[PDB]
């Protein structure tokens, strides 16, 4: 049982082996689920791997895991679009994603950049709710 974990460290030392390792982690995943987050920090074989990372993010209520999952998805334009969609669907917080898109949307020449910037500004803009 321990041997599989030992093998995983060997896989960690190192594509198919990555599949065996990711399967070894997804076999269920506590701190290990966060570690998959490390896999998102490193590499994702396919949207499916990214989807699994997203599932882990969904599983943990706290915000950072979800942010990491979104990042994994991006790593270009399609990934950025997916991140934007997630932000639109996500009502959790505007700060982590705010800065992300800012630097992410600095590789665009025209229209969408000015228009995109305007859209970002629009998104940014009892008691507190009334204000």
């Amino acid at each position: 049982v321990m041997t599989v974990r030992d093998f995983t460290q060997v896989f960690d030392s190192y594509e198919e082996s990555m599949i065996a390792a990711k399967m070894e982690t997804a076999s269920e995943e506590e701190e290990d689920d966060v570690d998959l987050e490390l896999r998102l920090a490193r590499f994702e074989q396919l949207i499916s791997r990214r989807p699994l990372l997203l599932n882990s993010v969904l599983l943990r209520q706290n915000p950072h895991h979800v942010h990491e999952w979104h990042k994994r998805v991006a790593l270009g334009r399609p990934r950025e679009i997916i991140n934007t969609y997630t932000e639109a669907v996500q009502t959790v917080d505007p700060f982590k994603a705010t800065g992300k898109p800012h630097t992410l949307w600095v590789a665009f020449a025209k229209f969408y950049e000015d228009n995109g910037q305007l859209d970002d500004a629009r998104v940014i803009l009892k008691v507190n709710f009334k204000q």
């Binding site: 791997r49 599932n55 334009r77 639109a88 228009n115």
Partner: protein, 1322 residues
């Protein structure tokens, strides 16, 4: 007017009428208007005309431009269409006289485009649609292809909108030069040829416009004529076929897109009609699949995921470019993220608020519509314009994601839908929403999906039938509860049902990874039924059924009436048994459970579960899984559908790595000969043919066109190696000596005894080489001997290349292993897989092989002990495989190496003096003649000893693996070199085999033309790829496409989809070169004539030509075969006591009487088998056998009384055949059924039929023209053997002119034998 059409036939064109009236155009005009049109194109009328050979004998051979008319054109198309409906060759007469076909074809085109409701009615133009569909589906016919080319080539693009054409030429700049070249060559044309060319180039695009206007004429709710519906249906069928074939798709796909047909269709009133447009909708979904199919139109390659994404990204990008530059009201919308903008939802949000004019303008900038002139309003609907832009740009899910969301079980919404699950009553007049099998497929996904869906539909239909049979028997009645008035063997009331697990989805999926449930039944039944229900095992599929009965208690059920209303059918769901629970709550030395309650844990389809849950949560639908009150089981052998579908899905999911030299041929395009051994780059120059040739004379005779040169001149020195060139007709033959295997002469190898013909040799030669080898083996041409010789040659030439053998039946496997046993193949290298009565002398199952190894290990370890003692080594302990290995290296190899050091590094005497193993071989050495001889004798002794230790090293695994299952795994993965199974087993076990790491290099198949397409493909992938490539080195297929095809339970799937077509047959049709075995050895030459006309040069082997047993006549019968005319008996010919249960009392009684006659003559009753083409007649002949023979001592029983279809691969000395039919020819018109029927007899064939009916059938003529060359009245010789086939008999020949005369004769003959003899069995 059946007497009218028939009298006309007799006068003007019928076969077997010496002199006919000359051609008269008015006959064609009269028949079309008064018989075909007036009867509303009645199928029976059209059948009669077609069967009477109207097309071949009247229509086409008298067709010319000067006589061509509407009636003439339509009549030809009706006949061709009917031939397709009946699955008989449709194009032969056109191929015979091709001269006027181009004129005819062009005018079919004109007629198809004729103004709606004009000269041609909509039905008539539907007939033309179907005819043209057949044409496009028949481009393999040169005559048809040469006409269709101009309709579907690049020049057809002049039908494109001018802006779209330019867009495409800019997209693929290399296209423009070819476009220019076309325009140039067009200049060289005279004005009429140019006009004809332009009309042909525009045909399909103009046909689309005609369809669109027909479609628009369909009202939303007001009554609609069925002719409009059916026209639209057949049109989409045509679109699908054009789109699903690359040569027709290549340029037409762009044309279809430019027309926006698909958007028109999805917004149409017709699809909105829930009943009328249902079939149209399902056909539409198929078309949508292909218009968006993942293939590059120009390269023909499948599109990657990246390429798909790029295509979608580029579309959005160009839409945003146009948005930014020219749209102000929607300018803010352009600035949107491409992903956010792309979903259907986002696109509707952005373009939905815009005006019709603006959307038209947007579309125009994308070259989708012509420019909207300034200040003009668009003529298009806003919903059209919106759906045009939205559907074009929205996100699409891939074909794989689409497949992975399909439930593997049919629901109540599928099982009774006869558009996709037709009954056996399907006439072929309407079309179905089904895939078609012909020659080509777009990609592997297309190929696999067509087979997936076709397999899926038939299984669902079978399941529905089973449910109807078992649920009806239960008699569900109202009590608002249900009470069951009857009981069923295969279905039980559910006592309890509970979903017990809904597992979380895997990453990238929206369905639970696993859904399980507990279902309880109360086995208050007969112990036989209790046992069967307890006989359920893991992976068994059951169906969960919900009835809410409609009838009060006691209400009679009528099976003729709609089943669903009869029992109140509400839901059907599938499930798969995990296991029965025991009284400790464990999923099942099986226990004896107490009481009558039983609970099974089952798997539910997770996709179906999610859909049902989604439906419940979103739409308030009731929870289906709280309603089940019936569970139905099935026969295990008929219930593998779910496993097969899963395997196919897995294959689609994997990279499907087949050999690169196979991929194109499998898909049916490219050079059909490119996998022949002569074209393989890795063709082997020198091969050891071992024991293939019996002598150098046999070898020389085996290669007629070659010059044989032997490496040794001495005729006494002439196994053989043969080297093939790369003058070039020269073969270099090297005789060589089999290495001595020890001092026991009985350990010399078994040898082949079959003197293979030069053709059989070509097959064996091909099978030994890399690549695709296809062998066509007519009845009795030695398919099995060819097979085992190939297997043997591969075994010896390439040790540790593993061979996979796949057949259709266990009988073929029995035959292969029987012949394998007579050859030099070690039985430790043999393995047979299966889910069976042992029929071979040895047991090659996992069980038999584990047992052999265990018993052989014991004997060999005892030899090691004897060797130890003969060497004077002390030690009382027995050896294991482990210590035997140590012993070999330490005691045996050492002694041998020392010995070789002395005598091979030199007298005859020292070979024997220093030989280290004299005492061990005392029970068996040297001759003292020459060094070379005795040295090799010594070498052979060492090989003998080494073989003992080689085996023990292989057998060590049985010491490391205790269980029989692990031991069998070792044999399967490692030890066996020859592994055999049925295609059925291969399909079921593929998953387990891949998981085990099963590996193999070569595949040989038998009965290949009896195996379904997809079940032929699956055995190619029972292993993982190796370094990115398939390990497969050889593919040998042996079969006969001129005999019967795979069995399709519901023949509607054959009629519409050609689902019976094997891969073997498709490959022959595609043009893959075949080796055609040409000499049969099991039947008389005279009998062989009845079917050898069907094959290429099929003659007879010498022993058939020369042995007395084939020239000895059949006692009491003048002829060795006869066709016997049987008229009516008591006013009846064919009869039908139950629907489709065809019988013929006159024929049956005659057949039985003949069987009795033969028995009373002293025939071995077992050497006679009785065959017929219908099950109804089979039971009737059996009925008469029991009621006329009964307890008769003088009369035995025939070996079998069965149908021709159930007698495939079987034979007897004498066959009595009843053809039954008197009204219509029926399924014997299939020449393959004919050939099988003509070849079941070794020595005697006697056929009883209404001769006139079958004589009139054109396809059956080559057989029946031979059969009617002899009398149609049975010639008997009742006082009779050693009489020869040709010699005039030395007895009286009496002629029986009918059945009653025969039944009289046999009665009198028997009553004379009862008085004069008395036999005694008790």
């Amino acid at each position: 007017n059946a007497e009218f059409v028939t009298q006309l036939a007799c006068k003007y064109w019928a076969p077997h009428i010496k002199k006919k009236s000359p051609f008269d155009i008015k006959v064609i005009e009269d028949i079309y208007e008064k018989e075909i049109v007036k009867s509303r194109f009645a199928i029976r009328k059209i059948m009669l005309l077609e069967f009477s050979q109207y097309l071949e004998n009247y229509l086409w051979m008298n067709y010319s431009p000067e006589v061509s008319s509407k009636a003439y054109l339509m009549s030809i198309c009706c006949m061709v269409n009917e031939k397709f409906r009946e699955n008989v060759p449709a194009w032969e007469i056109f191929k015979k006289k091709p001269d006027h076909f181009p004129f005819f074809f062009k005018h079919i085109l004109k007629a198809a485009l004729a103004e709606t409701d004009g000269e041609f009615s909509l039905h008539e133009q539907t007939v033309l649609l179907l005819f043209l569909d057949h044409c496009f589906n028949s481009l393999e016919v040169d005559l048809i292809r040469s006409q269709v080319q101009q309709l579907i080539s690049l020049p057809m693009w002049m039908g494109l909108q001018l802006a779209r054409l330019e867009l495409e030429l800019k997209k693929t700049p290399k296209l423009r030069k070819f476009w220019n070249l076309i325009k140039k060559n067009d200049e060289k044309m005279d004005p009429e040829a140019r006009e004809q060319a332009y009309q042909e180039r525009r045909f399909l695009s103009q046909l689309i416009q005609k369809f669109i206007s027909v479609l628009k004429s369909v009202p939303l709710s007001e009554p609609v004529t069925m002719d409009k519906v059916h026209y639209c249906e057949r049109f989409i069928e045509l679109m699908i076929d054009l789109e699903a074939l690359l040569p027709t798709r290549r340029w037409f796909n762009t044309i279809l897109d430019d027309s926006h047909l698909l958007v028109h269709c999805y917004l149409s009133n017709l699809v909105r009609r829930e009943e009328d447009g249902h079939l149209f909708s399902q056909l539409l979904d198929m078309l949508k699949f292909y218009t968006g199919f993942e293939i590059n139109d120009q390269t023909g390659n499948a599109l990657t995921e990246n390429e798909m994404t790029t295509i979608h990204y580029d579309r959005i990008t160009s839409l945003q470019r146009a948005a930014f530059a020219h749209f102000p009201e929607l300018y803010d919308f352009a600035l949107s993220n491409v992903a956010e903008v792309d979903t259907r939802e986002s696109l509707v949000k952005f373009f939905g608020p815009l005006s019709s004019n603006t959307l038209h303008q947007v579309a125009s900038y994308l070259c989708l519509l012509p420019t909207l002139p300034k200040n003009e309003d668009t003529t298009f609907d806003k919903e059209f314009l919106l759906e045009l832009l939205v559907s074009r740009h929205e996100r699409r899910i891939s074909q794989i994601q689409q497949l992975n969301q399909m439930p593997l079980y049919p629901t109540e919404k599928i099982i009774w839908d006869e558009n996709i699950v037709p009954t056996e009553y399907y006439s072929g007049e309407g079309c179905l929403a089904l895939p078609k099998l012909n020659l080509q497929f777009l990609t592997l996904h297309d190929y696999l999906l067509r087979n997936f869906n076709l397999f899926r539909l038939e299984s669902t239909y079978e399941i529905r039938q089973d449910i109807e049979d078992s649920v009806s028997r239960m008699k569900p009645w109202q009590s608002g509860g249900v009470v069951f008035g009857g009981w069923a063997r295969m279905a039980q009331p559910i006592v309890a049902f509970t979903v017990v697990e809904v597992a979380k989805p895997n990453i990238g999926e929206n369905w639970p990874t696993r859904v399980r449930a507990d279902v309880t039944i109360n086995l208050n039944v007969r112990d036989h039924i209790k046992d069967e229900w307890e006989g359920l095992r893991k992976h068994d599929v059951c169906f969960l059924i919900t009835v809410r009965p409609t009838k009060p208690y006691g209400t009679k059920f009528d099976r003729r009436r709609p089943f669903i209303e009869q029992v109140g059918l509400v839901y059907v769901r599938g499930c798969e048994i995990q296991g029965m629970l025991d009284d400790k709550g464990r999923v099942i030395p099986r226990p004896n459970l107490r009481g009558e309650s039983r609970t099974f844990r089952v798997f539910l389809d997770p996709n179906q579960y999610q859909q049902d849950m989604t439906n419940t949560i979103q739409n308030g639908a009731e929870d289906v899984y709280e309603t089940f009150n019936i569970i139905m089981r099935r026969k295990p052998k008929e219930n593998n559908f779910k496993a097969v579908l899963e395997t196919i899905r897995n294959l689609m999911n994997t990279d499907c790595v087949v050999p690169d030299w196979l991929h194109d041929i499998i898909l049916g395009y490219g050079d059909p000969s490119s996998a022949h051994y002569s074209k393989m780059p890795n063709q082997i120059a020198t091969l050891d043919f071992n024991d293939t040739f019996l002598s150098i004379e046999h070898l020389k005779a085996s290669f007629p066109g070659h010059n044989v040169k032997v490496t040794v001149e001495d005729p006494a020195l002439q196994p053989f190696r043969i080297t093939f060139p790369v003058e070039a007709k020269t073969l270099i033959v090297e005789p060589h000596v089999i290495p001595n295997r020890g001092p026991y002469p009985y350990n010399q190898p078994k040898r082949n005894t079959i003197q293979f013909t030069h053709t059989q040799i070509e097959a064996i030669r091909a099978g030994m080489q890399p690549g695709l080898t296809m062998v066509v083996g007519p009845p009795g041409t030695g398919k099995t001997d060819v097979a085992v010789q190939i297997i043997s040659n591969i075994y010896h030439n390439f040790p540790e290349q593993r061979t996979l053998i796949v057949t259709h039946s266990n009988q073929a496997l029995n035959q292969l292993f029987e012949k394998i046993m007579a050859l030099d193949i070690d039985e430790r290298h043999l393995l047979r897989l299966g889910h069976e009565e042992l029929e071979t002398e040895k047991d090659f199952s996992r069980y038999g092989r584990v047992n052999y190894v265990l018993a052989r290990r014991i004997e060999l370890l005892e030899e090691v002990k004897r060797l130890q003692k003969s060497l004077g080594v002390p030690g009382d302990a027995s050896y294991t495989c482990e210590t035997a290995g140590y012993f070999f290296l330490y005691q045996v190899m050492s002694r041998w190496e020392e010995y070789i050091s002395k005598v091979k590094n030199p007298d005859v005497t020292e070979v024997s003096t220093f030989f280290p193993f004299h005492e061990y071989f005392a029970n068996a050495i040297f001759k003292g003649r020459s060094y070379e001889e005795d040295m090799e004798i010594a070498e052979g002794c060492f090989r003998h000893i080494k073989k003992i230790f080689t085996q023990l090293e292989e057998f060590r695994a049985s010491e490391l693996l205790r269980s029989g299952l692990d031991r069998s795994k070792y044999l399967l993965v490692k030890e066996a070199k020859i592994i055999a199974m049925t295609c059925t087993h291969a399909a079921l076990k593929r998953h387990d085999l891949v998981k085990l790491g099963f590996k193999y290099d070569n595949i040989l198949m038998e009965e290949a033309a009896q195996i379904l397409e997809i079940e032929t493909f699956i055995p190619l992938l029972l292993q993982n790829p190796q370094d990115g490539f398939s390990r497969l080195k050889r593919w040998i297929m042996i079969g006969d496409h001129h005999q019967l095809p795979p069995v399709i339970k519901n023949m509607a799937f054959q009629k519409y989809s050609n689902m019976e077509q094997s891969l073997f047959t498709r490959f022959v049709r595609v043009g893959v070169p075949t080796v055609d075995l040409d000499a049969q050895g099991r039947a008389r030459a005279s009998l062989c004539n009845l079917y050898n006309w069907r094959y290429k040069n099929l003659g007879n082997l010498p022993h058939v030509q020369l042995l007395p047993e084939f020239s000895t006549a059949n006692a009491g019968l003048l002829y060795d075969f006869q066709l016997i005319n049987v008229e009516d008996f008591q006013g009846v010919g064919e009869s039908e006591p139950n629907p489709y249960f065809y019988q013929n009392l006159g024929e049956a009684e005659y057949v039985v009487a003949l069987f009795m006659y033969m028995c009373l003559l002293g025939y071995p009753a077992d050497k006679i088998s009785i065959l017929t083409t219908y099950n109804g007649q089979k039971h009737l002949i059996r009925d008469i056998i029991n009621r006329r023979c009964g307890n008769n001592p003088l009369i035995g029983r025939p070996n079998k009384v069965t149908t021709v279809d159930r007698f495939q691969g079987q034979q007897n000395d004498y066959i009595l055949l009843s053809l039954v039919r008197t009204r219509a020819v029926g399924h014997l018109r299939d020449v393959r059924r004919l050939v099988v029927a003509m070849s079941r007899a070794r020595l005697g064939l006697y056929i009883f039929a209404r001769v006139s009916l079958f004589q009139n059938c054109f396809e059956l003529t080559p057989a029946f023209s031979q059969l009617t060359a002899r009398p149609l009245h049975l010639h008997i010789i009742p006082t009779e053997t050693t009489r020869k086939n040709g010699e005039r008999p030395s007895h009286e020949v009496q002629i029986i002119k009918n059945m009653p005369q025969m039944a009289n004769f046999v009665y009198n003959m028997y009553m004379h034998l009862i008085q004069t003899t008395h036999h005694y069995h008790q």
